[PDB]
Design a protein around this ligand. Structure first.
Ligand code: ATP
Ligand code: MG
Lengths: 51, 393
């Protein structure tokens, strides 16, 4: 119960963090970069997180 | 690799040995110098961290634009995905030999400077048109052409195989070849054989594919077919069944005839016009050559004109053997009896005879083809004659 309450108390400031775009991967390339189509915008050559 | 242009006599000569020995000596000097300097200090760390500075300069979220115009002063107009266009600076680490209008460039996120170019798909029309290795077969299958094979080789193969012979005499190779003959003699067969035996991008188009349904698309198709023929190094463009697009060009016609004429004019210009044609060789086949345009088959357009005659007496035996090679036969086959008749038989007719004989043997369940089977198949094949007996004779 205490964990539930604590999570619901920090969730207010956890919910103001910016979302993340959802894109479609075209093909991996280069050192560690990727080519992604972020609809409705154009494509990007983005990095990849270490994980 | 951007090496010196020898431009010595260009024929095996002592001057060309000396210029070449000099290049080898200089290259040996460079190799020794680089090896010794690498041993003294790797310089790998120095080579690295320049890439790190470059990656710092080009931010993480590189955007893909579309180059529109180069102002020729390390500046450009680049269009973003939304449609907006920006006047930016082409930075120094981008290989400018790749930049051309319409290319997919990589743009900086904040400053939109050009910081790279992306590779592009490889099928404008190449995958559709190119034939790869001809599935039919190599030169072995073709039987009884011989002289025609030699002419085709002297036209398309020899220039790529031994060009010194031409460069010595100073003559450029003959421009193009047109293969003409009655239906079923081996024009397409020879074209496919040279396609599979050659080392150049071979493109095949049937004239009926140039009769498009929308205005200007036939001309656009020919323009693009020759456009992706200089982009692919040595190439051979084989326009089979030219008779569909080329014709006497009678002015008094209406309908799609005008559009076909315009397509033919565009093809004429591509074959020989204001611009140099680069290194592209053209082959054309036509059952009916008498109806073509003199402008289309004038000497400077098509130099060589090869005639394909119907097999007479021994070419017939050769085709029969070639097409019955992979087929078990009973020891009673009178192939000579089959061919002896002067029935104007064509090679396609022989192939049909063999295939139908095999098919009817299969139908009867037998394990071997018989002479009677071959005779009945030949009779069935020759049943497709038609026409009127007394008429014309
Ligand atoms: N001399 C030959 N040797 C082997 N096969 C032959 C010969 N002549 C014709 N053929 C056979 O004819 C078949 C029909 O294709 P081919 O290339 O011969 O036609 P074509 O002469 O170009 O005819 P068309 O003018 O109608 O286009 C080929 O599959 C080939 O098997
Ligand atoms: Mg043909």
């Amino acid at each position: 119960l205490n964990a539930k309450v604590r999570l619901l108390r920090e969730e207010l400031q956890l919910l103001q963090e910016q979302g993340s775009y959802v894109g479609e991967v075209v093909r991996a390339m280069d050192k560690k970069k990727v080519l992604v189509k972020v609809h409705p915008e154009g494509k990007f050559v983005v990095d990849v997180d270490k994980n | 690799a951007s090496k010196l242009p020898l431009v010595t006599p260009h024929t095996q000569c002592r001057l060309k040995l000396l210029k070449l020995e000099r290049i080898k000596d200089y290259l040996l000097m460079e190799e020794e110098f680089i090896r010794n300097q690498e041993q003294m200090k790797p310089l790998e760390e120095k080579q690295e961290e320049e890439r790190s500075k470059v990656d710092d300069l080009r931010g993480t979220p590189m955007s893909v634009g579309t180059l529109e115009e180069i102002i020729d002063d390390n500046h450009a107009i680049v269009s973003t995905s939304v449609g907006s266009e920006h006047y930016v600076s082409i930075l120094s680490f981008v290989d400018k030999d790749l930049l051309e209008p319409g290319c997919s460039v990589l743009l900086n996120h904040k400053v939109h400077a050009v910081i790279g170019v992306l590779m592009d798909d490889t099928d404008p029309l190449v995958t559709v048109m190119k034939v790869e290795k001809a599935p039919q077969e190599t030169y072995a299958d073709i039987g009884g052409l011989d002289n025609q094979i030699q002419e085709i080789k002297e036209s398309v193969e020899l220039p790529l195989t031994h060009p010194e012979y031409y460069e010595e005499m100073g003559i450029k190779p003959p421009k193009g070849v047109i293969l003409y003959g009655p239906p079923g003699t081996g024009k397409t067969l020879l074209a496919k054989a040279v396609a599979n035996q050659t080392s150049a991008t071979f493109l095949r188009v049937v004239g009926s594919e140039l009769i498009q349904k929308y205005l200007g698309d036939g001309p656009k198709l020919v323009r693009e077919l020759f456009r992706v023929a200089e982009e692919h190094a040595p190439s051979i463009v084989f326009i089979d069944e030219i008779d569909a697009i080329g014709t006497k060009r009678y002015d008094s016609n209406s309908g799609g005839e005008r559009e076909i004429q315009r397509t033919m004019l565009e093809l004429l210009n591509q074959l020989d016009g204001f611009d140099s044609r680069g290194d592209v060789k053209v082959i054309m086949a036509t059952n009916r050559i008498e109806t073509l345009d003199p402008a289309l088959i004038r000497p400077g357009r098509i130099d060589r004109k090869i005639e394909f005659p119907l097999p007479d007496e021994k070419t017939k035996k050769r085709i029969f053997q070639i097409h019955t090679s992979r087929m078990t036969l009973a020891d009673d086959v009178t192939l000579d009896d089959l061919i002896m008749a002067k029935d104007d038989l064509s090679g396609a007719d022989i192939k049909a005879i063999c295939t139908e004989a095999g098919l009817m043997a299969l139908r009867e369940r037998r394990m071997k083809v018989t002479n009677e089977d071959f005779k009945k198949s030949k009779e069935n094949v020759l049943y497709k004659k038609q026409e009127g007996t007394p008429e014309g004779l």
